[PDB]
Design a protein around this ligand. Structure first.
Ligand SMILES: O=c1[nH]c2cc(C(F)(F)F)c(N3CCOCC3)cc2n(CP(=O)(O)O)c1=O
Ligand SMILES: O=c1[nH]c2cc(C(F)(F)F)c(N3CCOCC3)cc2n(CP(=O)(O)O)c1=O
Lengths: 365, 320, 50, 49
């Protein structure tokens, strides 16, 4: 949402045609540096690369080196290869590589929604004590006579004269099961009230430690080239996986990657720039979210031709804007305020209720 | 009797179940923080910054919605939510049992999290975007070279490597982070276990009565019939006498309030510093407590009437 | 059969009880707008002026 | 210092020729960028909880 075509752009002209983070950032920079400007879109629509053969710069970085433009106000990454040919002001927005997964949805009965309230460890002990009572009663009452009795005490076990001994056993065992079934009921009610559904865990290291959930990056870009050249422990293994993962875990465009995450039911994760990711999270149907911190530290900056007059002024302007919280304000305006999705609002929405069949089904089987 | 007793236990077990549910429902309601907006939306958990520094001056000058409210709170929060040094702030978080949060630079915070006893953790993303850099005198020769050097180091992942070396690797903890993974998140065996021990205890008691019972059978009581009557009579008389002693116990309730107050149904007393005790003999206690509590008359005193009746009934029973 | 069927109905009646408790707990959770601040804290109910 | 208008610490030792370079967790602020030169950030941070 840095630079976009306004709704009625056809009925507008000049700088009024465009709107976005950088569009506002331009006006701010121009105000503190004192100058009029004309917003222009780069021809080839590229950022700033260098063809090895022709040794020619393209995109905005190019239009700067060849005198086509006076300044570049866009999400231009501050890279060493560019800092050599042009000048970058201090970062007006720090970012990095992030992880994108599906919407923390939720749904699954598998009679395993009955063993959860009551822990697997508890179901076990209640069974051990179960046969632990049917064996104690068995000692109360030749080889077959013990089998018929063990089957009778197992029927006295499968739950529902005055031999005081085994009498208090039946009473205590009853009080025991009473507490348990009461606990199960109470706990299940808590579950049916709050009903919070967590999810996996944010930590690139989590993607490497598992394989169930596939993941990849863009087939071409700094994101992919990052893992390839990265000598860091975690990122190394990740690349090794993606490098030979079949089918291809890499996508053609960013839209394809997001679509793959929205159609894999949480089986595919997509790695991309945090900036674009955070924005996607604020777009319908609000089914994507960023997890964990960034993998690296990057940053965009205002690019100005080497040895320019606007150099120092713009640099200070960026620092001034950030300290006035104007930069943070702008981001909030285009990312969250102008957004449409919601996370802290979906958790603040106290409302829901309805029984299904999933959980109950497990008890039928 | 069996019907009423059944209806009685029905209500109790229903109460136990219902009550146990609220403690589990609320146990799930609990939602630790995660963002700065969470600190503003609540007040139970206090929070502050360093009494002097860019951190404090940030909130003061910040015109952002969330950070504004936060400053408004800290600006007039009592006692002082601001600390003298960073060490004091961390100590306040470690000694408040999670009732106090401290706002500081992420860099120093991340480091603290990797230090014993590993009882602190950073939550949510940063509130603002800053950055350290290599400073060189204006118009210096090392200017451009160093600048490029920093960019080169970062691209080679050398910077990230260095941080990992001194922040995470240098640890250490390195253990407190593997336990902070936040795996568990359900009920538990603890409570249920207590009911298992009382079960086995009941089984053991029965295994004892079984053998005991057998022994008794073998033996086969007539001696008790003769001395049992006398024994039971004196036991009853002893119980009645002690019931009367219990009711007069110059200590039916003590309402500490450091002095020391202890009362029964007849006297209200007080032990003053140091040791001297005085009593206000009143005899039993219905007074002007506007209790009622909605009928007419009966208590206080009602307990007097029940105790007196009990002793009279016990005397008639002992005699007969 | 009688034992398993008993354990089956036990779970169901327990589920019914627990779930029914939730329908009343949430029924109380619901709060109605009392002031303006209530209009800002929520989004379900739209609002506007002239 | 507002009164004496004197720089202190590392930033000071740079302006008054005491040192040639400052390698430390020095925050890149506007007030400092005016008197000295800051290389690109070698570590991005912020305020945390
Ligand atoms: O200067 C650069 N600025 C960039 C800014 C952005 C965006 F975040 F969208 F603003 C992106 N995207 C991130 C998500 O995927 C779609 C496009 C790529 C950029 N690239 C290409 P890189 O070589 O992959 O870094 C640059 O070169
Ligand atoms: O350039 C600066 N760099 C700084 C770097 C750090 C650290 F993170 F420790 F490296 C700290 N601390 C953060 C935690 O509290 C103890 C010291 C203060 C710094 N300050 C002082 P400010 O005025 O409060 O910002 C600067 O001026």
């Amino acid at each position: 949402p840095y630079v976009m075509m306004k709704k009625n752009h056809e009925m507008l002209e000049g700088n009024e045609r465009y709107e976005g983070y950088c569009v506002d950032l331009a006006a701010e920079i121009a105000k503190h540096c004192g100058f009029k400007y004309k917003l222009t879109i780069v021809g080839d629509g590229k950022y700033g690369a260098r063809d090895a053969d022709t040794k020619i710069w393209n995109g905005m970085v190019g239009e700067l080196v060849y005198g086509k433009a006076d300044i570049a106000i866009a999400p231009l990454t501050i890279t060493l290869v560019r800092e050599e040919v042009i000048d970058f002001s201090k970062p007006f927005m720090s970012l990095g590589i992030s992880i994108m997964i599906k919407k923390p949805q939720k749904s699954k009965p598998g009679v395993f929604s009955f063993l959860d309230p009551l822990a697997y460890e508890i179901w076990m002990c209640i069974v051990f004590a179960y046969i632990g009572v049917s064996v104690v009663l068995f000692l109360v009452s030749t080889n077959e006579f013990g089998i018929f009795n063990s089957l009778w005490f197992s029927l006295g076990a499968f739950m529902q004269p005055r031999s005081l001994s085994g009498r208090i056993v039946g009473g205590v065992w009853w009080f025991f099961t009473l507490i348990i079934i009461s606990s199960y009921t109470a706990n299940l009610a808590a579950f049916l009230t709050v009903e919070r559904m967590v999810s996996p865990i944010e930590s690139a290291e989590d993607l490497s430690k598992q394989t169930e959930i596939a993941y990849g990056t863009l087939d071409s870009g700094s994101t992919k080239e990052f893992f390839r050249r990265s000598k860091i422990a975690v990122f190394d293994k990740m690349w090794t996986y993606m490098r030979s993962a079949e089918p291809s875990v890499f996508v053609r465009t960013t839209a394809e990657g997001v679509a793959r995450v929205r159609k894999s039911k949480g089986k595919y994760a997509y790695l991309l720039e945090s900036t674009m990711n955070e924005y996607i999270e604020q777009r319908k149907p609000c089914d994507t979210m960023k997890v964990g911190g960034n993998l690296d530290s990057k940053g965009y900056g205002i690019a100005t031709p080497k040895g320019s007059s606007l150099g120092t002024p713009v640099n200070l302007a960026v620092l001034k804007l950030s300290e006035q919280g104007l930069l943070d304000k702008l981001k909030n305006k285009w990312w969250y305020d102008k957004g449409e999705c919601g996370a802290k609002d979906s958790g603040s929405k106290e409302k829901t209720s309805a029984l299904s069949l999933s959980n109950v089904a497990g008890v039928f089987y | 009797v069996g019907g009423v007793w059944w209806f009685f236990t029905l209500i109790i077990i229903s109460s136990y179940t219902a009550n146990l549910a609220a403690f589990l429902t609320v146990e799930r309601m609990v939602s630790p923080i995660e963002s700065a907006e969470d600190l503003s939306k609540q007040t139970e958990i206090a929070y502050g910054t360093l009494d002097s520094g860019s951190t404090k001056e940030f909130f003061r000058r910040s015109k952002i919605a969330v950070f504004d409210k936060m400053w408004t709170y800290m600006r007039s929060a009592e006692p002082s939510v601001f600390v003298r040094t960073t060490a004091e702030g961390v100590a306040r978080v470690r000694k408040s049992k999670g009732k106090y949060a401290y706002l500081l630079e992420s860099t120093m915070n991340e480091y603290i999290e990797q230090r014993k006893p590993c009882d602190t953790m950073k939550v949510g993303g940063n509130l603002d975007s800053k950055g350290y850099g290599i400073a060189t005198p204006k118009g210096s020769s090392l200017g451009t070279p160093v600048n490029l050097a920093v960019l080169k180091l970062s691209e080679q992942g050398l910077l990230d490597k260095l941080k990992n070396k001194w922040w995470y690797d240098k640890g250490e903890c390195g253990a407190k982070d593997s336990g902070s993974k936040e795996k568990t998140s359900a009920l538990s065996l603890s409570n249920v276990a207590g009911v298992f021990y009382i079960l086995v205890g009941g089984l053991g008691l029965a295994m004892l009565v079984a053998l005991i019972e057998f022994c008794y059978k073998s033996r086969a009581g007539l001696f008790d019939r003769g001395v049992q009557m006398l024994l039971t009579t004196v036991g009853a008389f002893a119980a009645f006498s002690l019931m009367t002693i219990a009711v007069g116990t110059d200590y039916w309730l003590y309402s500490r309030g450091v002095v020391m107050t202890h009362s029964g149904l007849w006297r209200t007393c007080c032990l003053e510093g140091n040791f001297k005790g005085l009593c206000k003999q009143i005899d039993h206690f219905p007074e002007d407590a506007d209790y009622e509590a909605d009928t007419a008359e009966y208590f206080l005193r009602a307990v007097r009437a029940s105790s007196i009746f009990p002793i009279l009934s016990v005397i008639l029973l002992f005699m007969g």
